[PDB]
């Protein structure tokens, strides 16, 4: 059957009909090596990002785009973030780009900060619960893209969930699972996270956080020797 024609006939998106959408020990290893959650309220447009130390192995960047809303950040604002100043020489970025011009401007940003794109992770949104509009659009936009970039020398590239209710800007928590399963290292930064996204193993920095516990010296002590190079998927280093 043609699910595109079906969508035209019924308003049910084709992704509504995708079905079914030994790693547990590895999730347990991730959980064992996770640093305590750490978080900082900061107005990222006015904040010297260099105060965030040490340099990060993974950056998840989730700027609040205007298209998310039926303080917004333009790609002008995002491009001027000085991400290369806090990324480790070998490191990874995950940039939520939305569904419109961000698919191009987000790639400009990755190159500006010294990354090359190595994956395009698509969040496919179903409308099972409510079967059934940018002026440039040719098609109804039913997905968002998270670009993964790399700099320096188990999972699929799809996330499928029901489209959240209007005014809900949260991205699927599955993106954290994909990132952590890569075992890229333990210094993990989420820019534009919220109280609701704080997570063990992550430093969350955002303007709407209600509380902070970030201390640069304490944070760095989580990665001091013998722990400096752990992937975040290996067993803790024995002390005492």
């Amino acid at each position: 059957n043609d699910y595109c024609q079906h969508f035209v006939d019924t308003g049910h998106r084709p992704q509504n009909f995708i079905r079914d959408v030994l790693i547990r020990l590895k999730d347990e290893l991730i959980a064992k090596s996770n640093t305590p959650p750490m978080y900082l309220q900061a107005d990222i447009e006015a904040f010297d990002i260099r105060e965030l130390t040490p340099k990060f192995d993974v950056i998840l960047l989730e700027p609040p785009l205007e298209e998310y809303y039926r303080k917004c950040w333009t790609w002008d604002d995002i491009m001027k973030l000085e991400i290369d100043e806090i990324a480790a020489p070998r490191s990874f970025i995950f940039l939520w780009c939305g569904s419109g011009e961000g698919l191009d401007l987000g790639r400009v940003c990755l190159r500006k900060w010294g990354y090359r794109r190595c994956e395009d992770i698509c969040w496919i949104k179903t409308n099972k619960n409510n079967p059934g509009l940018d002026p440039k659009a040719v098609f109804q936009r039913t997905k968002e893209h998270c670009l993964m970039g790399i700099k320096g020398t188990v999972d699929i590239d799809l996330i499928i969930t029901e489209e959240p209710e209007i005014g809900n800007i949260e991205k699927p928590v599955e993106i954290f699972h994909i990132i952590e399963h890569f075992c890229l290292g333990r210094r993990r930064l989420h820019l534009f996270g919220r109280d609701s996204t704080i997570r063990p193993g992550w430093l969350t920095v955002g303007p709407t956080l209600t509380n902070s516990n970030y201390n640069a010296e304490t944070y760095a002590s989580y990665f001091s020797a013998p722990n400096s190079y752990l992937t975040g998927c290996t067993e803790e280093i024995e002390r005492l």
């Binding site: 595109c4 009909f17 995708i18 569904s99 098609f139 699929i156």
Partner: protein
């Protein structure tokens, strides 16, 4: 002229100015990502896509580093990218087939000029369909393109015999000969190629 038409040719060398103007272009290029039929990045840049449309849409299949190179070509050829279709690949029971396994293929959607009378927003930007023979694009894309722009002339570059469709002219070097039915195209073809040969 509605029935399928095609031209076996090296698309690097065909004079596409004889084909007229099209509401929709689709290309599935042999990007250099070399294997037989591949075009270099420069050959891709130099394709005379700009003569093929005044106002309409371009559908450009991309993978790997052609996600970026295809954006470069689209812009060099005079298009703005305004959508990106993904085809989620499934088996006959609707289950999904370097850092991640790949469940999808990507098709950029570019616009040139300011098209009028198209039916934008009828379809969504996700295709869910079976891999019906490896390396083929899903037939669903022709349906979405026809609902978008019904009855208009369309041209496909780097297609194969299974791709020929009504309202479409298909170009590719594995098509069987030259089959042209539109009198405007037939006239300009004989004028340009009196002895049927397409060289240099």
């Amino acid at each position: 002229l509605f029935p399928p038409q095609w031209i076996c040719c090296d698309i690097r060398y065909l004079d596409v100015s004889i084909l007229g103007k099209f509401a929709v272009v689709m290309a599935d290029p042999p990007w250099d990502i070399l294997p037989y039929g591949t075009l270099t990045d420069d050959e891709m840049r130099r394709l005379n896509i700009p003569v093929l449309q005044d106002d309409g849409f371009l559908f450009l299949w991309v993978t790997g580093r052609a996600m970026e190179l295809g954006r470069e070509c689209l812009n060099l050829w005079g298009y703005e990218r305004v959508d990106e279709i993904i085809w989620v690949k499934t088996n006959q029971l609707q289950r999904i087939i370097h850092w991640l396994n790949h469940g999808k293929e990507h098709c950029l959607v570019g616009v040139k000029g300011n098209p009028q009378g198209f039916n934008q927003g009828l379809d969504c930007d996700v295709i869910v369909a079976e891999v019906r023979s490896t390396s083929h694009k899903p037939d669903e894309i022709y349906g979405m393109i026809e609902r978008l722009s019904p009855g208009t002339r369309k041209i496909e570059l780097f297609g194969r015999p299974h791709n020929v469709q009504p309202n479409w002219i298909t170009l590719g070097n594995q098509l069987d000969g030259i089959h042209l039915l539109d009198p405007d195209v037939v006239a300009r073809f004989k004028q340009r190629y009196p002895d049927g040969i397409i060289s240099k």
